[PDB]
């Protein structure tokens, strides 16, 4: 939840270009910090700078919430220096300025990146201070200090420390840190009920929730640029010759009953309708996985179910999961979120993972939702019987694209084109457009930012492989 990050760069002629990569990584990192809605207080320090703010360590920016102005100041006013100064003094100044920040407001985790030794050992390994050392590669005092830090971090972390070095090529070709966007979830305590005798407390979580938006689009006037000068007014004009206002109490919630509209009041509905009172999360029945088909997987929310947050309930749920798994038994659950919830029917099936075993639940449709559309079967339609040459062509096309790692038998097949791990490109496009607007409020038409295509498109070698079967199919037709 809480994070504390500071910037310490070995900027100068030594980066002359890795300096450009470091600059753009810094810009995208601060953009992610701004757009991620984080409560981190960033601070910037400078070393070997003209003027004294007191050891040639001049402090530039204190701690505050990230914003567009800070990024613009970083982009503009921060330029490489031509002075040399001790970086140990810069580290000491950073620790001194972070001491009062820690005292005033407590944090949780510290993370530092880059693109005597006793003091470092004491300060870093004290409570939670940590950093990841990224290299621009793939003077001699700088090299020896770098090596010292290398042994410190591999001794502090171990094998994980050994494999925590990535080149800028691995930060640009592949993605190293680019997915700092996430939404928080609310836990739902509940109690699973089996008939009348059994009632076991459970914890329910929204496993797969549909994409939302943190903010909302605000309409402002082109001159006042504020919602306070906009008054949204909606009125009900009576169906008379002119405009005659009708107030809300004179409005009746009529319903189109066939060819007629019958008056009704929403309060009357509550008076003379009924809903499932309280929470009703109870099993309804059991059947086989064969009967259940993906064609009846309606709804949007995916509800993963764990044990209540006891352990006896946890092992009972695990045993039930195993019992449903080995027999391929699927249970029917009547779901009610709360007292006011709509009565829902769905199916929950066990979730198998090495770390833990979960019970994911999905909703099921009523017969009203299901619809029938009789069609003509094409597998026996002689008027559209496929040609065996077409069969050969499509067979040659099918095996052309093999996104899985079907090369080793001792190792499982792995996707060469992962899909489910790709976020919504629209949110990133919106963020980039907002950044363009902040930087260029006068320049219109933000660029389409084509580099989002590459991870959104199949691998180039896959396309080249596909080029041949598509070519031979095109000649076929």
Partner 1 sequence: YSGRDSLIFLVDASKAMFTPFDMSIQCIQSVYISKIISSDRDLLAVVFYGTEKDKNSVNFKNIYVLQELDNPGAKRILELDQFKGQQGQKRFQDMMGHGSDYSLSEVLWVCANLFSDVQFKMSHKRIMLFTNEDNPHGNDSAKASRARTKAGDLRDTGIFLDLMHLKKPGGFDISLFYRDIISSKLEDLLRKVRAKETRKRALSRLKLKLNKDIVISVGIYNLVQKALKPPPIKLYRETNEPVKTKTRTFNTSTGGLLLPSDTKRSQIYGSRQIILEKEETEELKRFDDPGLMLMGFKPLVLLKKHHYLRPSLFVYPEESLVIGSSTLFSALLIKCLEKEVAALCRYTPRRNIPPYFVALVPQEEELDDQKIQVTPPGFQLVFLPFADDKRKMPFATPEQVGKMKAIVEKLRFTYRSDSFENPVLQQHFRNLEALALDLMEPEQAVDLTLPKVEAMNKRLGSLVDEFKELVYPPDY
Positions 191 through 210 that interact with DNA (CB under 7 A): 206
Residues 118 and 25 sit within 8 Å (Cβ to Cβ): no
By CB under 7 A, is residue 337 in contact with DNA? yes
**Segment contacting partner 1 by CB under 8 A, of 55-63, 122-130, 166-174, 203-211:** 203-211
Given partner 1, DNA, none, residue 337, with its beta carbon under 5 to 8 Å by kind, binds: DNA
Residues 245 and 237 sit within 8 Å (Cβ to Cβ): yes
Residues in contact with partner 1, shown as a per-residue x/- string from 301 to 340 under the rule CB under 8 A? -x-x-x-xxx-xx-xx-xxx-xxx-xx-x-xx-x------
* Cβ distance to DNA smaller for residue 306 or 337: 337
By CB under 7 A, is residue 349 in contact with DNA? no
**What is the DSSP code (8-state) at residue 380?**
S
By CB under 7 A, is residue 271 in contact with DNA? no
Question: Least distance in Å: CB of 339 to DNA?
Answer: 8
| CA-angle at 64, arms to 102 and 438, nearest 5° | 155
The CA distances from residue 441 to 426, 434, 436, 444, in Å, are 21, 9, 7, 7
Plot region of 31 (φ>0 → left; ψ -120 to 50 → alpha; else → beta): alpha
Query: How, if at all, do strands 42-47 and 302-307 pair?
Result: unpaired
By CB under 8 A, is residue 188 in contact with partner 1? no
Question: Least distance in Å: CB of 237 to partner 1?
Answer: 5
Given DNA, partner 1, none, residue 213, with its beta carbon under 5 to 8 Å by kind, binds: DNA
**Segment contacting partner 1 by CB under 8 A, of 66-74, 78-86, 108-116, 158-166:** 66-74
Give the residues after which the backbone of the chain is interrupted, taking a C-to-next-N distance over 2.5 angstroms as a break.
16, 54, 115, 138, 309
> Could you give the 3-state DSSP secondary structure of residue 470?
helix
> Could you give the 3-state DSSP secondary structure of residue 186?
coil
Neighbours of 305 (CB within 10 A): 22
**Segment contacting partner 1 by CB under 8 A, of 5-13, 97-105, 118-126, 345-353:** 345-353
By CB under 8 A, is residue 259 in contact with partner 1? yes
Work out which of 103, 127, 186, 312 binds DNA, going by CB under 7 A: 186
By CB under 8 A, is residue 260 in contact with partner 1? yes
**Segment contacting partner 1 by CB under 8 A, of 1-9, 46-54, 107-115, 410-418:** 410-418
β-partners of residue 333 are: 283, 346
- Alpha helices of 8-104 — where are they, by DSSP H? 18-35, 68-77, 87-104
**Segment contacting DNA by CB under 7 A, of 60-68, 73-81, 93-101, 185-193:** 185-193
Site for DNA in 290-329 (CB under 7 A): 301
Residues 317 and 202 sit within 8 Å (Cβ to Cβ): yes
Site for DNA in 57-116 (CB under 7 A): none
By CB under 8 A, is residue 410 in contact with partner 1? no
* Cβ distance to partner 1 smaller for residue 122 or 179: 179
Question: Least distance in Å: CB of 219 to DNA?
Answer: 9
* Cβ distance to partner 1 smaller for residue 79 or 381: 381
Which token pair is 32? Answer: 């992610």
Indicate the length of the chain as a whole number. 477
CA distance 246 to 335: 41
Q: Which residue has the tokens 């880059």?
A: 114
Can you give the binding site for DNA, defined by CB under 7 A? 184-186, 188, 206, 213, 216-217, 234, 301, 337-338, 340-342
């Amino acid at each position: 939840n809480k994070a504390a990050v500071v910037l310490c760069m070995d900027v100068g002629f030594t980066m002359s270009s890795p300096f450009e990569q470091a600059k753009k990584v810094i810009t995208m990192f601060v953009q992610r910090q701004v757009f991620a809605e984080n409560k981190d207080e960033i601070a910037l320090v400078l070393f070997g700078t003209d003027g004294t703010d007191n050891q040639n360590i001049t402090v530039h920016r204190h701690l505050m919430l990230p914003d567009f102005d800070l990024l613009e100041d970083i982009e503009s006013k921060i330029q490489p220096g031509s002075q040399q100064a001790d970086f140990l003094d810069a580290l000491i100044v950073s620790m001194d300025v972070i001491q009062h920040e820690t005292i005033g407001k407590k944090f949780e985790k510290r993370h530092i990146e880059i693109f005597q030794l006793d003091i470092i050992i004491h300060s870093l390994k004290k409570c939670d201070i940590s950093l990841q050392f990224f290299l621009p590669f793939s003077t001699e005092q700088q090299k020896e200090g770098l090596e010292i830090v290398k042994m410190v971090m591999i001794s502090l972390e171990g094998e994980d420390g050994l494999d925590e070095i990535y080149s800028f090529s691995e930060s640009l070709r592949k993605l190293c840190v680019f997915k700092k966007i996430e939404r928080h979830s609310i836990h739902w305590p509940c109690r699973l009920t089996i008939g009348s005798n059994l009632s076991i407390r459970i914890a329910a979580y929204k496993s797969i929730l549909q994409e939302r938006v943190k903010k909302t689009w605000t309409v402002v006037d082109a001159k006042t640029l504020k919602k306070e000068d906009i008054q949204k007014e909606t009125v009900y004009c009576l169906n008379d010759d002119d405009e005659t206002e009708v107030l809300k109490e004179d409005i009746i919630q009529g319903f189109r009953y066939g060819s007629d509209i019958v008056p009704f009041s929403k309060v009357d509905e509550e008076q003379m309708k009924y809903k499932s009172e309280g929470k009703c999360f109870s099993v309804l029945g059991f059947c086989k996985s064969s009967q259940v088909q993906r064609r009846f997987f309606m709804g949007n929310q995916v509800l993963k179910v764990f044990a209540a947050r006891d352990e006896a309930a946890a092992v009972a749920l695990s045993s039930l999961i195993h019992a449903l798994d080995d027999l391929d038994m699927v249970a029917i659950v009547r779901y009610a979120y709360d007292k006011r919830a709509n009565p829902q029917v769905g199916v929950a099936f066990p979730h198998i993972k090495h770390n833990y075993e979960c019970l994911v639940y999905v909703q099921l449709p009523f017969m009203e939702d299901l619809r029938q559309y009789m069609f003509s079967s094409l597998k026996n339609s002689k008027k559209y019987a496929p040609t065996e040459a077409q069969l050969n062509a499509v067979d040659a096309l099918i095996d052309s694209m093999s996104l899985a790692k079907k090369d080793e038998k001792t190792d499982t097949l792995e996707d060469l084109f992962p899909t489910t791990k790709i976020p919504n490109p629209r949110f990133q496009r919106l963020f980039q457009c907002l950044l363009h607007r902040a930087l260029h409020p006068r320049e219109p038409l933000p660029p389409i930012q084509q580099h989002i295509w590459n991870m959104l498109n199949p691998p180039a070698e896959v396309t080249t492989k596909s080029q041949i079967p598509l070519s031979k199919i095109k000649t076929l037709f």
